[PDB]
Structure 1
């Protein structure tokens, strides 16, 4: 249950998310649920005049945005990228998860 976290947007879809973050500062982010899909979360982040979106995959016992860095929970994953730039897995996205969208 992540509803307490200022970065958690619940079941928000892409259009709403884009419309919301496009007006925010680079580094503003949210995690949203994708109930229908095999990847049931996405991270969305404002970066250099665009809103970028990253699939969060659950496979076997773990959760990840890249199979090269696997976590035991969504919270651990989010807290990792709060302090470690996304660029270690996406060049062209050199920012941390810097500002939760509700902050």
Structure 2
């Protein structure tokens, strides 16, 4: 079952306060759907960096009263790990036609 997924160990994908440049270093040469989460330069927000079509894409993660998320009406998740578990089985295409991947492979899995 999905309890086996590496996503359940937050250390496989949460790279703390790493900046954009460090995120890009980490994902170089990785297969599509490899991802990480980190703090954003936008203080108090987070970011997801994910490989799509061989390129690293960066998405801000909002922190709102109803939860974390990428956009309304999806700012719903009580933690980063709930967000990550959701998008392990939800393509980001519902947010942007150019992000048609799941959060498939934690960078340190």
Deviation at 1:90, TM superposition (A): 1.4
Query: TM-score of the superposition, structure 1-length normalised?
Result: 0.87
Write the distance in 1 (CA, Å) between the matches of 2:82 and 2:10. 15
Secondary structure, aligned partner of 1:52: strand
Of Structure 1 and Structure 2, the greater helix share is in 2
Kindly indicate whether residue 54 of structure 2 is the aligned counterpart of residue 17 of structure 1.
no
Structure 2: segments with no counterpart, 5+ residues: 1-7
Q: Residue 30 of structure 1 is aligned with which of 33, 36, 46?
A: 36
Structure 1: segments with no counterpart, 5+ residues: none
Q: How many residues align?
A: 101
Of Structure 1 and Structure 2, the greater strand share is in 1
Write the distance in 1 (CA, Å) between the matches of 2:43 and 2:11. 22
Could you list the runs of 4 or more consecutive aligned residues of structure 1 that deviate by over 2 angstroms after TM superposition?
2-5
RMSD over equivalenced CA pairs, Å = 2.0
Query: TM-score of the superposition, structure 2-length normalised?
Result: 0.82
